[PDB]
Amino acid sequence: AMEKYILSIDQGTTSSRAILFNQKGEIAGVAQREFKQYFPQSGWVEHDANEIWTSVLAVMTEVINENDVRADQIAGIGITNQRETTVVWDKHTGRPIYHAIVWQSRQTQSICSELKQQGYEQTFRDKTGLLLDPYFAGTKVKWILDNVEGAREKAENGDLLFGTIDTWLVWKLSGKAAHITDYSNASRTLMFNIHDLEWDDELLELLTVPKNMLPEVKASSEVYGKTIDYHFYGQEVPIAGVAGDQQAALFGQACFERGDVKNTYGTGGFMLMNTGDKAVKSESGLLTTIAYGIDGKVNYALEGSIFVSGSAIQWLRDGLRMINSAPQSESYATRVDSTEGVYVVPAFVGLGTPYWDSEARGAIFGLTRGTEKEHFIRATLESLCYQTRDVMEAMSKDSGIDVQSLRVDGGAVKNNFIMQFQADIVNTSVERPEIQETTALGAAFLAGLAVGFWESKDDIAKNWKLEEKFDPKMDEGEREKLYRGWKKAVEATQVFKTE
Amino acid sequence: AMEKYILSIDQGTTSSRAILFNQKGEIAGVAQREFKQYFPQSGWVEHDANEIWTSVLAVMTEVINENDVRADQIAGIGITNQRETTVVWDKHTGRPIYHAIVWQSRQTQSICSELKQQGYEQTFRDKTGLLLDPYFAGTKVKWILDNVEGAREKAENGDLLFGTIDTWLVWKLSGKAAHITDYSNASRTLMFNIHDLEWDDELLELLTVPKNMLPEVKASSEVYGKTIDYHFYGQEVPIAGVAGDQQAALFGQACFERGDVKNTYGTGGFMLMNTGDKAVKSESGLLTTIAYGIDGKVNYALEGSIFVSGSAIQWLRDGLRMINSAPQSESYATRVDSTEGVYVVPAFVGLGTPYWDSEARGAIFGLTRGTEKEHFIRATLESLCYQTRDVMEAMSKDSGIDVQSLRVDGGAVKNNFIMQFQADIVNTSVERPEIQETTALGAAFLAGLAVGFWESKDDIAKNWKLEEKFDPKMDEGEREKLYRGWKKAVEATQVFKTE
Ligand code: NA
Ligand code: NA
Ligand code: NA
Ligand code: NA
């Protein structure tokens, strides 16, 4: 028809989403499909990359069939994704050789430990902006090659390809035409040198990964290829935007300049501040990473990473079966006026910023006989806010900027209790936008800019609108007592080590 | 209708029960009524002594009325009770001047802290067999006298009486005719010297308790007085048995000789070993206490005290609202094969034997995204077994004897999962009797003995019947791994302390 749209695919940790955006920046359709989470041992997290692929096909098809947009009205596709999660597959069959190892997974701990013991952690820090934690892709690749029968040989024979999720989806979607990643996704692999913007041969040799398995690193806004016709209703549509999910949210929050910051509350909680054209080092447990590559420039970021944020609330539903839906948690949490000393430390897959303790597991403290369901749920919800304060403190310290207002996005932001508690505990305003799908919006703009659907990234800034600003309303004394109890809870959590 | 019965009152922490026994030792009727638990602040636990008194009247009435046994068929009454719990009342009005302060309550912490600071713990220990923990009566009397307005003045004037629950009930029931306690209950007050067998002047001065408030200390099997007619359907029935509930259970398990031991799983968990006619000092966190006074002799015991045992299960029911009843916990716990590294340390009111840490609160460890309701419940159930093991390691050290089989009673013993896991985690057989209401039976015998209903306590031994012997079937490697994580769980629990 006459109107054209951009299709954005957000392949998350627990679900895949496809959202259509019109010229005005409005959402013209959304579809979401969950896929299985595998936890074969304590702290491991795996996905079936085949199911992830079918979930992406499922949401593309749903969003095109069920709104008023046909495949021929799609001007371009942007792809964004859960970062670090690693897929290794056979290039001829297109079949993965093992589950995708998820970013959260701690299964590559023995590998990180060995590399740390051999004295290489500083080299990885200096070259990648990360550290030797199980979070990153490199060790997941090594794990697959070392532990899966036949993997090593196939790797040696040139039969295998590596990819983060963006890479996997583009290869499948393009009919094997394009094996690529962008700078933001590559920066999370532990194999890409963020300073010289090239795969690093030393790091690859330390990780025992053959260079023949790697995609070509590209900018985040560029026509990488097109959909193979049979995966897009007979049409060949430009695949033109790719960035890691948290970086996409950064771009979708118009945080384009040095000091601009946002926090995303998803499965995990990720605060990123754009540091412009220079990489900034951190002494307080932040990652130095790449924001995006566009217009021939590369922006870097400082990141605070929290492994379990919104997924703490989901655990209350799926795990303990205490609530029917995440939004229902607010009613329980607000039915009491305090947690009465209870803390929940949801270190289900260890602790990220600033602790970086991959052996810690989840714990709960301050329980008494009068602790009710309301208190427990309330404490679970406040853990999203306490973890964010930990990150903010590290971020304000290392950035040298005092954050006077945080833009936020992700599912948990709809929860007024959590947003207000957040503002209170950090004594900083929290701003929730009208369109909270910033990850999708960012990827849509990367693609749309590449195909000339939009002319300027500033449209994002212009279109952004404040839905609600939460202002701190809690005395310094209460705030400081509450936070001291949180830090004590984390301290106690770190003592529980059995492994 | 000719035949006579003994009525046994068990005034527990969460309910009062009245059980009728015939000459054959058979249960001829049971009535139970719950009363309100008050948790006004975290760690505090209070009861309304007026509601305890009406709950007792209620179960006496229900059990006779509903089993067609006439009041004039009761040959005697035995009273047993939650120990330490403290009532202070006006002798003219019979009205308590405050709630009863429960054994569990931590509200007397500061009072214990001051006496410890002043250097007085080892005097309390040497005289009473106890320690300066909020568990015991003495500091509860002081708290009431210091914090209830006008109370100090009324005490000084002779208007007030003190009683543990036994004393309160006997006073009310006899229409103010008898203000007494037995040696077992008195031994738990922090005011009674267990070696000299008398109220201790030094200890009263330190606690600031006037001696005029104290009842007379008697044997556990003696006619103390009779029911006042209007509280017992026009009859004046001998009140002839009084012992602390755990001591009554010891007696009811036929544990009459040196080395005989039982564990009772109730609100709390209590292991007592009879030590014959001599008091044994503990070096490993056991209390030295009085078992009972009968036939002109006084038996002593060693005790391991766990504050939260079966009440952890009740917490799943009324606190987190995860189960409909304690028995339903079994099906969830056995639906999985292990807790997968989850531990539940139910220190809601601190830790008793052997840690004696009154500031510790409840905690949970080892949580992952895959921890489900079933895991959480199972770990909660195992906590009863781990705490018992802690007490058994202590008990074995400060006695010579290593348990060969443990006689058990209380509400949780009906749960086969728990008894089997208990036997497995300690590598010792557990024997569950056919009649599990040993506390009630013990109190019935103390009464019946005193009125000639039974001529010998040997009948308890002869009537006891094994219902099921649980035999350990767990690999030693597994047992040691499991118990090591429990100990680490407790270590981490002890780190969480707030200001
Ligand atoms: Na997700
Ligand atoms: Na359910
Ligand atoms: Na109990
Ligand atoms: Na007899």
Curated annotation (Swiss-Prot), chains A, B:
> Assembly and partners?
Homotetramer and homodimer (in equilibrium).
Is Nucleotide-binding one of the keywords UniProt gives this record?
yes
Q: Reaction catalysed?
A: glycerol + ATP = sn-glycerol 3-phosphate + ADP + H(+)
Taxonomically, which superkingdom? Bacteria
> For the modification Phosphohistidine, which residues carry it?
231
Return the EC number: 2.7.1.30
Q: Name one GO biological process term.
A: glycerol-3-phosphate metabolic process
Q: Which family does it belong to?
A: Belongs to the FGGY kinase family.
Provide the residue positions that the database annotates as binding sn-glycerol 3-phosphate: 13, 83-84, 135, 245
Q: What is the protein's known function?
A: Key enzyme in the regulation of glycerol uptake and metabolism. Catalyzes the phosphorylation of glycerol to yield sn-glycerol 3-phosphate.
**Where does this protein hold ATP?**
13-15, 267, 310, 314, 411
Name the pathway.
Polyol metabolism; glycerol degradation via glycerol kinase pathway; sn-glycerol 3-phosphate from glycerol: step 1/1
Any Pfam family matching the protein? FGGY_C
Q: How is its activity regulated?
A: Activated by phosphorylation and inhibited by fructose 1,6-bisphosphate (FBP).
Post-translation changes: The phosphoenolpyruvate-dependent sugar phosphotransferase system (PTS), including enzyme I, and histidine-containing protein (HPr) are required for the phosphorylation, which leads to the activation of the enzyme.
Which InterPro entries does the record cross-reference, listed alphabetically?
A: ATPase_NBD, Carb_kinase_FGGY, Carb_kinase_FGGY_CS, FGGY_C, FGGY_N, Glycerol_kin
Q: What is this protein called?
A: Glycerol kinase
What UniProt keywords apply to this chain's record, in alphabetical order? Answer: ATP-binding, Glycerol metabolism, Kinase, Nucleotide-binding, Phosphoprotein, Transferase
Question: An example Gene Ontology cellular component term from the record?
Answer: cytosol
Q: Summarize where glycerol binds, as residue positions.
A: 83-84, 135, 245-246
Q: Where does ADP bind?
A: 13, 17, 267, 310, 314, 411, 415
Phosphoprotein: is it a keyword of this entry?
A: yes
What HAMAP family does its record include? Answer: Glycerol_kin (MF_00186)
